[PDB]
């Protein structure tokens, strides 16, 4: 379960 907002620079 990745958090996509941990780094918004990661697509």
């Amino acid at each position: 379960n990745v958090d996509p907002n941990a780094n918004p620079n990661v697509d």
Partner: antibody, heavy 121, light 114 residues
Framework: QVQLVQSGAEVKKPGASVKVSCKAS????????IHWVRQAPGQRLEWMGW????????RYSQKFQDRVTITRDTSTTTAYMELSSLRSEDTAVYYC??????????????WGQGTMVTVSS | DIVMTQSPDSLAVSLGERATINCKSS????????????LAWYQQKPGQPPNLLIY???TRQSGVPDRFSGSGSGTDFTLTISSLQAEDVAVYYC?????????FGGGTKVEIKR
């Protein structure tokens, strides 16, 4: 020509506040999020938070939620981090960085030179 | 918090020899949906800011010499420098961007034996 230039070293008394600046340059400022990372002397990197340079939304580390504020000035292509209620333990180097902009074509990662902040009486 | 633990804290190897650095994460950083490890390796030469070497655990950043390589999966990862050069004096950090807060390892200091 892509770079982040931070403000200079500062000294503060305990209980005061410090505001570090990160002047961006060489890319479209509003496209990427700027992170703030601190490196205490002889220790690992500690992530503090990021701000989206476009819409200005932020996310802070729980370790620093109470007393960190990250802002951005779109007209001057500058990001700011303010740490308040400073303690001597906050003596560290503070970095702004475009951490890991990962796209299919490229990887893009840029750091500012760091700002040393000493908290002392 | 995903805790990142590097091993060893320091190593010394001769010029031209292989240096290996280890990093273990509390939780797995392998995402089942895309089968990618959300892990990077940074190099910090003295007095300079960190510099990105490896991302997705094993992809070299543009301009990184070929002797740097990254491997591992899930919770166990390795950075290898196949033939150490004088300019590789630095502290190396692993980094996870799988969950918030982003976290970094404690760092491994590489010394050159000449």
């Amino acid at each position: 020509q892509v770079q982040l230039v931070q403000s200079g070293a500062e000294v503060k008394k305990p209980g005061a506040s410090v505001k570090v600046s990160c002047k961006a340059s060489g890319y479209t400022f509003t496209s990427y999020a700027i992170h703030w990372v601190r490196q205490a002397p002889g220790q690992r990197l500690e992530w503090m938070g990021w701000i989206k340079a476009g819409n200005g939304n932020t996310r802070y580390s729980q370790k620093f939620q109470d007393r960190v504020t990250i802002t951005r000035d779109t007209s001057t292509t500058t990001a700011y981090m303010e740490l308040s209620s400073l303690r001597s333990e906050d003596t560290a180097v503070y970095y702004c960085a475009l951490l890991t902009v990962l796209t299919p074509d490229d990887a893009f990662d840029i750091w500012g030179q760091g700002t040393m902040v000493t908290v002392s009486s | 918090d995903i805790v990142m633990t590097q091993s060893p804290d320091s190593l010394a190897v001769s010029l031209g020899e292989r240096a290996t650095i280890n990093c273990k994460s509390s939780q797995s950083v392998l995402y089942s949906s895309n089968n990618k490890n959300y892990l990077a390796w940074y190099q910090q030469k003295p007095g300079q800011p960190p510099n990105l070497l490896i991302y997705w655990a094993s992809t070299r950043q543009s301009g990184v010499p070929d002797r740097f390589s990254g491997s591992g999966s899930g919770t166990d990862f390795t950075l290898t420098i196949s033939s150490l050069q004088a300019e590789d004096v630095a502290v190396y950090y692993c980094h996870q961007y799988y969950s918030s807060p982003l976290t970094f390892g404690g760092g491994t200091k590489v010394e050159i034996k000449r």
